[PDB]
Design an enzyme around this catalytic site. Structure first.
Site, PDB file in Angstrom:
ATOM      1  N   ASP A  41      17.009  -8.866  -0.854  1.00 25.92           N
ATOM      2  CA  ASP A  41      16.213 -10.075  -0.606  1.00 25.92           C
ATOM      3  C   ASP A  41      17.022 -10.568   0.760  1.00 25.92           C
ATOM      4  O   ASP A  41      18.186 -11.180   0.523  1.00 25.92           O
ATOM      5  CB  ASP A  41      16.400 -11.186  -1.575  1.00 25.92           C
ATOM      6  CG  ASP A  41      15.975 -12.436  -1.178  1.00 25.92           C
ATOM      7  OD1 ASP A  41      15.103 -12.525  -0.167  1.00 25.92           O
ATOM      8  OD2 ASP A  41      15.990 -13.284  -1.939  1.00 25.92           O
ATOM      9  N   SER A  96       9.617 -15.643  17.261  1.00 24.86           N
ATOM     10  CA  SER A  96       8.582 -14.588  17.890  1.00 24.86           C
ATOM     11  C   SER A  96       7.989 -15.463  19.006  1.00 24.86           C
ATOM     12  O   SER A  96       7.940 -16.562  19.351  1.00 24.86           O
ATOM     13  CB  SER A  96       7.659 -14.422  16.734  1.00 24.86           C
ATOM     14  OG  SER A  96       6.373 -13.950  17.170  1.00 24.86           O
TER      15      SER A  96
END
Length: 330
Positions: free
Chosen positions: A35, A199
């Site tokens: 994770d 992004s």
């Protein structure tokens, strides 16, 4: 040193991925959920409340000659999906894919929430976010990666998750045969303890690319792709019959649909998520309403590039002095 381990979807939907991990001496192999959005290595154990164990493999520290109680240390964690676990702490030898760390904090669960009990395939979590998020008190502990880092050939790990198929976590090296083209690296902020990056935009299907900054985290422990409501609405508007359902808890779409791809930007590069990766199947057994793999982050407080996004790429988690993230197509 290096390590290399195969990671395997837990079910037919890729809801999560499990990776075998050796703990203790002799080895006890548990299947952990790696994770990159948390920083605790915790396991089902011989200390876990018996009624809260249902099929998981447990760690029994009393059977490990290298286990030592970390005196006075406790831990307690709550995850974004509302699940939780807590307990006490041992140090022990932990190996992943041939890479060994001695003195790793292994957090032994005394209590786990229902979602963990109900998932027999996940024996615990192995956190790979920054150690500043580790919950051990009163002395915070380091992640497996943080402990291994100095010994690694290169201070990196890579995630290569499969779509409905196994993939690989590598530690200490970049497998140049595992991706196509080049890896594009992008800046990371560690301010919130995550692999947080920006992004450069998105496209829906064959549509034009929209240049827009989207701050989010690379999180292998989250199943879906959670993005701003504007972006998500633009995606689902291209699917006839798709709608946001408050009763179901997100966007649903007719199972008869063919989903468009979704592209996200990494610098000047582009990662394309095929439409099929965005199908999470019937909302309930036999339903013709299917659950979407792109959902709104509104009210999470952060955008999350979870498995839906990451499995479309070869992803480098560069833990150099100034960390960065790399993405390549594959």
């Amino acid at each position: 040193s290096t390590g290399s381990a195969t990671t395997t979807p837990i079910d037919s939907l890729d809801d999560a991925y499990i990776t075998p991990v050796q703990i203790g001496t002799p080895a006890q192999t548990l299947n952990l959920d790696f994770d990159t959005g948390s920083s605790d290595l915790w396991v089902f154990s011989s200390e876990t409340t018996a009624s809260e164990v249902d099929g998981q493999t447990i760690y029994t520290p009393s059977k490990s000659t290298t286990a030592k109680l970390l005196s006075g240390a406790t831990w307690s964690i709550s995850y974004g999906d509302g699940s939780s676990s807590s307990g006490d702490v041992y140090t022990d030898t932990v190996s992943v894919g041939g890479l060994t760390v001695t003195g790793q904090a292994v957090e032994s669960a005394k209590k786990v929430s229902s979602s963990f009990t109900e998932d027999s395939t996940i024996d615990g979590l192995l956190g790979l976010a920054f150690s500043t998020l580790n919950t051990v008190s009163p002395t915070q502990q380091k992640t497996f990666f943080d402990n291994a880092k100095a010994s690694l050939d290169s201070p990196v790990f890579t995630a290569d998750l499969g779509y409905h198929a196994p993939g690989t976590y590598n530690f200490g090296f970049i497998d140049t045969t595992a991706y196509t083209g080049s890896i594009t690296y992008t800046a990371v902020s560690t301010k919130q303890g995550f692999w947080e990056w920006t992004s450069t935009g998105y496209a829906v299907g064959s549509g034009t690319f929209k240049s827009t900054s989207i701050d989010g985290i690379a999180d292998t422990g989250t199943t879906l792709l959670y993005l701003p409501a504007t972006v998500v609405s633009a995606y689902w508007a291209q699917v006839s019959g798709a709608k946001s359902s408050s009763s179901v808890g997100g966007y649903v779409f007719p199972c008869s649909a063919t989903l468009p791809s979704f592209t996200f930007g990494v610098g000047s590069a582009r990662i394309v998520i095929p439409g099929d990766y965005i199908d999470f199947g019937p909302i309930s057994t036999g339903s013709s309403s299917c659950f979407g793999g792109i959902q709104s982050s509104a009210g999470i407080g952060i955008n999350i590039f979870g498995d839906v996004a990451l499995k479309a790429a070869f992803v480098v988690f560069n833990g150099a002095t100034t960390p960065t993230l790399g993405f390549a197509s594959k």
